[PDB]
Design a binder for this molecule. Structure first.
Ligand SMILES: [Zn+2]
Lengths: 241, 121, 204, 63, 388, 286
RNA sequence: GCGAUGAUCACCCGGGUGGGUACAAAUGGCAGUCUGACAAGU
RNA sequence: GAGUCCCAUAACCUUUGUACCCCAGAGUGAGAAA
RNA sequence: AUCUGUUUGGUGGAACCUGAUUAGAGGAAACUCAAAGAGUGCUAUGGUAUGGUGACGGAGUGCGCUGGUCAAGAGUGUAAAAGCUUU
């Protein structure tokens, strides 16, 4: 398929900071913040621009759930160039690096991770990317890293925890701007494997409404994932009605 | 604090080893560290079982990192001799993986142990 | 590279002075970054070799300057008249492109104009499109002074006078190493540039 | 999980059918009945005539 | 009943005074939520009374740790003591709004006369101070909050991870990338030195094929006209007379076809030949450093195959962590383009690759790796070698 | 937050009275900062003291539930607590003065054999108390004498009494003839004012802490707010879902009104509908 | 005196043809060096 | 009059020279020896 | 090729039908002149306006207010205490 010597046409996506590489096959690609290297072995595309050699990275939907959301057709992403994004559950640079590419030099990414072993690489990756701030701390206690984070335009949560609703709740109140963005990736099995996936998704949305987050849209990630959905909402402190 | 973490207690060790033995009869078990590493790459692992007395322990400490990256449950059992015996081979086994198969006869038994491993983590 | 030699570690930034290397506004900026630097410490064993690499960079730049001064001396003795007109650097490339001084001398002035742009020239000639007009002479000082369409005209004028001076360099049996023919040739092109640039297209 | 409509409560009272027990009988399974604010608001607006319906709707087993 | 507010910045501690108290019963009403966003409305609620910047980067990290652990630093104790008025422990207490509830019990211990509040009313004020940031400080030197967050963020994160330069293996990748570059440049420049001096004495390039010896000789015999018996001894000292080149050059310099080049040209040749000399010495210095670093970073891998071969293997994987995470088969094809590990010959290569994979795992996941396991693992390969 | 701190199944019968107090135990200082206490009384002949965990302050880091029970011979109908000290009074078939540190009524007050339906302690002259009887009567007590003082009989029963927070000797009464009467303690022959807007029985009354307004709840499913200097309401509040207003109170900032009806809902109202709770710029304010 | 810390798994006559990776050289190829008298001012 | 701006300071093809290679590749996964 | 005549790309745009629009449809210029919309930036800060009308201000005295230490008193508790509450 997308072999080495193949030639492709790069065009912009509907979302700012995201691109499409056309050909016999289409690829979702983001401009490389740190040219010449791959974070996790993804394919890369070089374009000769007047000349400077700019580079692009391939975004694999089967590895990043945010990428799966783009393929499935999310209407609104608050992640855009020149915005501050608080990334919860940043295991490594598999998805944060691509988010760091979208926000660009002007934006920042606050990557929050708990486990130290994935944390160590997040530090090493962050030093190739000046706009990533790694915060090796538990997301269940935002008070610990309140010094480190300012107000953020969007909050992205990939934490696979049964009480993610409280984690997203606490972080938004401290750091998310009014009318800001919230993006959640919900895996039904982690939250409650006893009940069906549809029940779990309806339950998580109800909790978000209780927390003054107005859901805007919901999307399931098939064929890339099973029993997964991404809920996109807005933080309306004034009122959801 | 110790490198092998979490380590299953006596009650949970037997429950795990039973699933390992049934998986071997059903051809749903991959034995060895190298084979376990491959299955994580393909995303076909329900969970990884490792032996905590491996000499040295570090030769299987890469698997937890791959597991956490892929969000695959993992757990350590005290003995590699016991793990090898349950796996069905005639030699000690330091690491093993339960292959994912939605049409298997031991779905409930696997998912029962899988849930307990998640609580332990 | 010179900053590394002066200060080896961010700690030294507090007391080290970067005045001779950097201006005031720049040197203070690096000092602030030093205390708040995001990077990690390095051992003396690492610092010793990073200094060794840095010593190579400054020494490379020194010898590169020496070779540049050497080439100027060679060009001012093998083709003094050409150097007066086009310059040492561009003249050297014109000789090197043809492979010899005599080979360049036997070329017509039109070729010298478009010497370095064969790829554009022969593509255009075969596909019935307009041909390039600058070639390698585009980087001469006189062409830079010209603007707009006058760049194309000065390339035509400068190439013609370069052939006059170059031929005097190659084929003169008793040439003085003075560049006198080049100096008078240079004045003609400057006068041509002055009147050519003095004209204004817009009605006054 | 069952969403209760306002008229459902009124007819259930007419036929002497308990909400929780009646649902278990119909489906032979545990049912988690649910009343939204709209349904609760509609019951309150019906007036004093439907005070009995309002009190049953407030049974603790109804979430 | 909130009267003072404590806000923790990366730069320092700020204390505010609450001029007006916002409505609590109507806290969830929209207009009281919007006033937090509006600076015109917010500024009537609170006012800055004190600010105490940290001395430097070191103090910031210590107070970041203490605030994370809910402890009252000496710096925090000073600012609070300077600002908060003395009140009774029982009759009436000055009220302080703090973001973190865990910090309340600590402040109460130091200051019995202050009651800490972190209810939703307090959080709303803290949210407003965070929202407007430096705008509330009336120009007081708060540096730049965004920039200091980056420095403090990395510091706090690594301190918990206990990141060390010892775990660093990128020095190996730099050294190997530089070492082969030097091996290319030394050859390329040495070849040029042969050409330039070839014009002046073409045959001598044939006499001394080894380029490094040729450069040192050319540094001595700058002009082939200069030929003395003492000079013959001095160049005879260079290398050895076993090859006889010492006699050949003297006899051959007398009768040769090289056209004499100018003094300035000779100056370039010797300086350029001197250049080739420096890189050769630097290359050896770097090579020893790579050997030394390999032992420290990956003693097992270096001992099992070698420092240079291990360094090439780490670079191919891109990092020591990448090499460890790979399966044994992938490691074998990782060195299958340069034949790093190289039917019976292949069996050793496949056998050796598995051991190299385990050697990497010991090095990568050990804070202070030893070479004890590398030695026995290499020994196991030697027995396999003898068997086959 | 409009959320419960706690919920108790306090009494088997009807809750006929409730008051939030700060107890003063002889040997123990209760933590008012971390705990708030309420007293409840009911027709099952028992008075219970409860403790509730609150999150006002973060100076600590339980014992949340029933603390003490006072048994009575007869059913209780009203309860109120002395502001300055711990003593509280209950009104049932007989009005009894209780002390928190004693399980039996410390003193017995009663004008006669008639029962008491409600009572309310004065807010400034804390030693003065007023009660209402089933015989269409209002009785005044003074604890400094441990005796009743004055009694007046009206044409109809009065359901509630509130004392003026800014005027120690003035109190308003909710009456059953669609009216509320403003009285002076020292001269009860004449009323200071009459409020006439309601069309059913007035069941509760409350003063704003500023003392310039009163709010009345009525059986006609409405809430009316009066200016103390005018005999007619300036406002009426209602809803289709509100079914019989039995209780009305003012928020302690005088900005809101809390009403409880028999449909089971406790509603919040603005004291002045056109006002808003946000902080105003000087240009808004002026 | 084994092993999951990993068992097992092109052509032609000792000689010559066929194929692959990397680097360097070529005065080897593509591969052929634009036009030619007017222009600017009063 | 006339494309420096697709590196003629270059790319590609051919020849020669030098050093290595002729097993699977996301390799397979319980045999081997007797 | 005084062969053949389809496809691909450009030029052109009759009739019928369908839709939209209509003092026909457009283009260029700007440190030009107007009438509006949206967003953003800025301490954008009197919850009741300077310490002060010789109607005053400063110095000092007294009263008043605040903090904890000590002593005594009252209550609670005890065999007696210790201990705790105190507007
Ligand atoms: Zn609804």
């Amino acid at each position: 398929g997308a072999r080495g010597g193949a030639k492709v046409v790069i065009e912009p996506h509907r979302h700012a900071g995201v691109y499409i590489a056309r050909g016999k096959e289409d690829l979702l690609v983001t401009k490389n913040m740190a040219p010449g290297e791959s974070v996790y072995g993804e394919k890369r595309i070089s374009v000769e621009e007047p000349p400077t050699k700019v580079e692009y990275r391939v975004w694999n939907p089967f590895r990043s759930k945010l990428a799966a959301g783009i393929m499935g057709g999310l209407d609104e992403l608050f992640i855009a160039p020149g915005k501050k994004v608080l990334y919860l559950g940043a295991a490594s640079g598999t998805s944060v690096s691509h988010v760091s590419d979208v926000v660009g030099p002007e934006g920042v990414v606050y990557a929050v991770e708990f486990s130290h072993r994935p944390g160590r690489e997040l530090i090493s990756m962050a030093k190739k990317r000046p706009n990533i701030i790694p915060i090796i701390e538990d997301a269940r206690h935002p008070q610990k890293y309140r010094m480190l984070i300012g107000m953020v335009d969007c909050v992205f949560a990939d934490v696979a925890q049964p009480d993610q609703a409280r984690i997203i709740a606490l972080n938004s109140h401290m750091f998310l701007k009014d009318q800001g963005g919230v993006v959640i990736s919900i895996k039904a099995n982690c939250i409650d494997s006893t009940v069906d996936a549809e029940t779990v998704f309806a339950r998580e949305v109800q909790k978000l409404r209780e927390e003054r987050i107005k859901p805007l849209e919901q999307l399931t990630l098939e064929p890339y994932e099973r029993d997964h959905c991404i809920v996109v909402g807005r933080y309306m402190r004034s009122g959801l009605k | 604090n110790p490198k092998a973490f979490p380590l299953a207690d006596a009650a949970l060790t037997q429950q795990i080893l039973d699933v390992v033995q049934q998986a071997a009869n059903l051809r749903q078990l991959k034995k060895g560290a190298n084979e376990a590493t491959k299955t994580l790459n393909r995303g076909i692992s329900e969970f990884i079982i490792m032996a905590a007395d491996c000499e040295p322990i570090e030769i299987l400490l890469h698997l937890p990192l791959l597991c956490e990256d892929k969000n695959v449950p993992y757990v350590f059992v005290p003995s590699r001799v016991a793990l090898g015996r349950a796996c069905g081979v005639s030699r000690p086994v330091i690491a093993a993986s339960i292959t994912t198969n939605d049409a298997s006869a031991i779905k409930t038994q696997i998912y029962a142990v899988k849930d307990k491993i998640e609580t332990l983590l | 590279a010179r900053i590394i030699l002066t200060m080896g570690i961010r700690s030294k930034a507090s007391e080290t002075d970067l005045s001779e290397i950097l201006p005031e506004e720049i040197e203070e900026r690096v000092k602030t970054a030093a205390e708040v630097s995001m990077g990690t410490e390095i051992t003396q064993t690492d610092l010793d070799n990073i200094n060794a690499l840095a010593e190579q960079i400054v020494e490379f730049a020194a010898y590169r300057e020496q070779l540049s001064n050497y080439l100027s001396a060679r060009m001012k003795a093998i083709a003094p008249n050409l150097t007066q007109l086009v310059g040492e650097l561009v003249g050297a490339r014109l000789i090197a492109h043809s492979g010899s001084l005599i080979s360049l001398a036997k070329s017509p002035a039109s070729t010298i104009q478009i010497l370095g742009a064969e790829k554009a020239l022969f593509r255009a000639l075969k596909t019935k499109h307009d041909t390039p007009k600058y070639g390698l002479l585009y980087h001469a000082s006189l062409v830079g002074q010209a603007t707009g369409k006058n760049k194309g005209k000065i390339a035509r004028v400068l190439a013609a006078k370069a052939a006059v001076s170059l031929r005097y360099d190659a084929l003169a049996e008793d040439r003085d190493d003075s560049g006198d023919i080049g100096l008078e040739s240079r004045a003609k092109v400057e006068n041509r540039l002055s009147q050519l640039e003095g004209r204004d297209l817009r009605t006054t | 999980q069952v969403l209760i409509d306002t008229n459902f409560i009124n007819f259930s009272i007419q036929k002497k059918v308990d909400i929780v027990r009646g649902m278990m009988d119909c489906l032979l399974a545990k049912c988690n009945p649910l009343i939204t604010d709209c349904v609760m608001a509609e019951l309150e607006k019906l007036g004093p005539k439907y005070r009995i319906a309002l009190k049953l709707a407030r049974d603790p087993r109804i979430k | 009943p909130i009267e003072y507010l404590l806000f923790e910045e990366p730069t320092g501690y700020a204390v505010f005074k609450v001029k007006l108290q916002q409505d609590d019963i109507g806290s969830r009403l929209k207009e009281v939520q919007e006033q937090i966003n509006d600076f015109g409305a917010f500024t009537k609620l609170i006012e800055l009374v004190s600010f105490a910047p940290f001395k430097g980067a070191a103090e910031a990290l210590e107070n970041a740790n203490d605030i994370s652990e809910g402890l009252v630093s000496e710096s925090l104790k000073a600012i609070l003591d300077l600002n908060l008025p003395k009140a009774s422990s029982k009759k009436k207490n000055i009220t302080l709004a703090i973001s973190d509830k865990n910090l309340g019990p600590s402040i109460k211990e130091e200051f019995p006369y202050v009651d800490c509040i972190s209810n939703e009313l307090a959080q709303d004020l803290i949210r407003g101070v965070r929202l407007h940031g430096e705008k509330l400080f009336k120009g007081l030197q708060s540096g730049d909050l965004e920039r200091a967050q980056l420095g403090l963020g990395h510091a706090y994160s690594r301190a918990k991870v206990k990141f060390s330069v010892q775990k660093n293996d990128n020095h190996i990748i730099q050294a190997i990338a530089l070492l082969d570059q030097l091996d290319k440049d030394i050859n390329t420049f040495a070849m040029r030195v042969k050409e330039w001096y070839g014009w002046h004495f073409p045959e001598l390039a044939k006499l001394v094929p080894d380029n490094y010896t040729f450069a040192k000789l050319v540094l001595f015999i700058k002009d082939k006209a200069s030929l003395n018996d003492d000079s013959l001894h001095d160049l005879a000292a260079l290398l050895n007379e076993d090859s006889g080149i010492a006699q050949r050059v003297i006899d051959n310099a007398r009768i040769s076809m090289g056209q004499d080049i100018s003094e300035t040209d000779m100056e370039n040749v010797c300086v350029f030949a001197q250049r080739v000399a420096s890189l050769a010495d630097y290359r050896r210095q770097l090579y020893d450093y790579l050997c030394e670093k390999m032992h420290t970073v990956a003693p097992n891998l270096s001992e099992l195959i070698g420092e240079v071969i291990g360094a090439r293997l780490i670079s191919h994987a891109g990092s020591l962590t990448n090499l460890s995470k790979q399966a044994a088969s992938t490691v074998q094809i990782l060195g299958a383009e340069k034949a790093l590990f190289r039917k019976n010959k292949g069996r050793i290569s496949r056998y050796l690759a598995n051991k190299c994979s385990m050697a990497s795992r010991i090095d990568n996941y050990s804070e202070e790796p030893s070479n004890v396991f590398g030695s026995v693992l290499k020994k196991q390969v030697e027995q396999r070698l003898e068997f086959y | 937050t409009r959320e419960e701190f706690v919920s108790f199944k306090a009494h088997y019968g009807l809750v006929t009275g409730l008051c939030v107090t700060q107890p003063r135990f002889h040997d123990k200082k209760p933590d008012l900062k971390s705990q708030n206490f309420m007293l409840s009384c009911s027709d099952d002949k028992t008075v219970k003291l409860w403790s509730i965990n609150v999150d006002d302050y973060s100076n600590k880091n339980n014992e949340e539930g029933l603390i003490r029970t006072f048994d009575g011979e007869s059913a209780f109908q009203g309860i109120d607590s002395h502001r300055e000290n711990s003593t509280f009074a209950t009104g049932g078939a007989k009005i009894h003065l209780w002390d928190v540190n004693r399980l039996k009524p410390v003193s017995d007050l009663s004008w006669g054999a008639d029962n008491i339906t409600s009572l309310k302690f004065n807010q400034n002259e804390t030693d003065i108390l007023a009660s209402t009887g089933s015989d269409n009567s209002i009785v005044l007590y003074d604890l400094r004498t441990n005796s009743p003082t004055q009694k007046i009989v009206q044409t109809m029963r009065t359901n509630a009494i509130c004392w003026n927070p800014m005027e120690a000797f003035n109190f308003v009464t909710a009456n059953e003839d669609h009216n509320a009467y403003y009285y002076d303690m020292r001269n009860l022959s004449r009323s200071l004012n009459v409020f006439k807007d309601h069309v059913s029985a007035v069941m509760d009354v409350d003063f704003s802490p500023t003392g310039d307004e009163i709010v009345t709840g009525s059986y006609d499913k409405s809430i009316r707010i009066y200016k103390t200097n005018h005999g007619h309401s300036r406002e009426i509040y209602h809803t289709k879902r509100m079914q019989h207003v039995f209780q009305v109170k003012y928020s302690m900032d005088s900005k809101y009104i809390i009403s409880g009806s028999d449909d089971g809902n406790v509603r919040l109202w603005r004291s002045k509908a056109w006002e808003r709770s946000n902080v105003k710029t000087t240009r808004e304010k002026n």
